[PDB]
DNA sequence: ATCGGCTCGCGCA
DNA sequence: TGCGCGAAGCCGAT
């Protein structure tokens, strides 16, 4: 590759081969943005060294049927804006429909690709697709970490027990890896599905319409105006956070009645904005130092340790990935009698006895983003009022992935594992049902914020 | 061959 | 509200 502000350690070879005659193809998956994208940039750099065009390919899977119209519209509306952004950079974008394992392979043959580059996800499905693609192509294949500031395989070579073991290794490498971004260079070389993306959205929304979330009077639950989608909207949210919410963040990040969070998770999850970008802007901002340490810890340690978790523990969304002490503790309490037991359907409709739990579910149903403090309480009550730890993990993941705009994310699996299974936490006083897993109480919540205001806001 | 230090609830102001 | 301890398993600095 060979260039300024392009550390070679951000890229690694999935497969070696003979470089092809054709264009460099960036298989975009996790990081759906033109700016501050190390994978797009590396793909562009390979293109310059080889005197070839860079092109972006994206696969429209049947995974959308798993979630709702809320996330399909957010992603697809974002992708319509992205096609236009990429087009201004003279970068063509190709949208394939179907299975990435077969469709990426066929595209490389059909479009005569020279080099394949993709971004990094520690999720099982991306790795499965990469394995399939490797078996179907002759060309060199590179992986670039565009999501984490320090590349996941570089920060640590093993599972990290706690944030404290991770913090020294990540912080030692931050001076090297926390750096500004080069501008994306438009295409120099002339670049050689048929449906419109609007058509795809229309066909997909008709397929999802029967199962769309409705209130009892037939009126839809989802309010689409809370987070407008796309790269342009993402940046406006980051700007208002620094301007309006970062000063109060150290004091108020755990009060759900206050709108004092970044609101960046839906854009971060789809890769509509870079975490490295957000950290650069926050570092430079003159703000309360307590707020800066609190927020940088969240977007650097906690977000990037969630990738460490999924990358070194392939069963990240199961019981086995919990630490020994936690699995041992939860196992001993499997027979304990739950105070309540709710089904997925009762949980989903917000019909528990706990008005605070119900309000947290209604914030999830109506806005698509539950406040970060109540997500801890929400997941820990699923554990407390479920038949088993496995049923709890299953119900929390089902509701999180169906209804959160930021769901189906390593942060989600690491966050749920912390809450239910103690991952990256320590043991606490033993209790019935939840054992030594950290406990959170309705009364504890009453002490810390105006619980009644939150409940009133969400019926 | 031994210890300091890690993202709650509670009792106290 | 803000503070110090309790209950608690283990990592790694020494
Ligand atoms: C049960 C549970 C489920 C969760 N599910 C998800 C999910 O599906 N998707 C998701 O992106 N996050 C998830 N989180 C982490 C966190 O709640 C959200 O990222 C955060 O509330 C998003 O809102 P924000 O971006 O306004 O938060 P901010 O406070 O502004 O945080 C900014 C960023 O810091 C990172 N961050 C903050 N808290 C955490 C954390 N605990 N772990 C990892 N990264 C963190 C995120 O990237 C987040 O976007 C979950 C946490 C819990 C306890």
Numbering used by the authors: -2 to 189, 196 to 462
Copied sentences from the primary study:
Cyclobutane pyrimidine dimer (CPD) photolyases harness the energy of blue light to repair UV-induced DNA CPDs. Upon binding, CPD photolyases cause the photodamage to flip out of the duplex DNA and into the catalytic site of the enzyme. This process, called base-flipping, induces a kink in the DNA, as well as an unpaired bubble, which are stabilized by a network of protein–nucleic acid interactions. Universally, the C-terminal domain of DNA photolyases contains a reduced FAD cofactor (FADH−) in a unique U-shaped conformation, which acts in both light absorption and catalysis.
In order to address this issue, we present here the first co-crystal structure of Methanosarcina mazei class II CPD photolyase (MmCPDII) in complex with fully native, phosphodiester-containing CPD DNA at 2.7 Å resolution. As expected, the global conformation of the MmCPDII–DNA complex resembles the previously published structure that harboured the formacetal linkage. In accordance with the low conformational selectivity of MmCPDII for CPD, PDM presents a quasi-canonical CPD photodamage, with a tilt of 50.6° between the base planes. Relative to the CPD backbone, the guanidine moiety of PDM Arg441 is 1 Å closer to the P0 centre of mass, allowing the amino acid to form a salt bridge with it. Furthermore, the PDM Arg429 side chain is shifted by 1.6 Å.
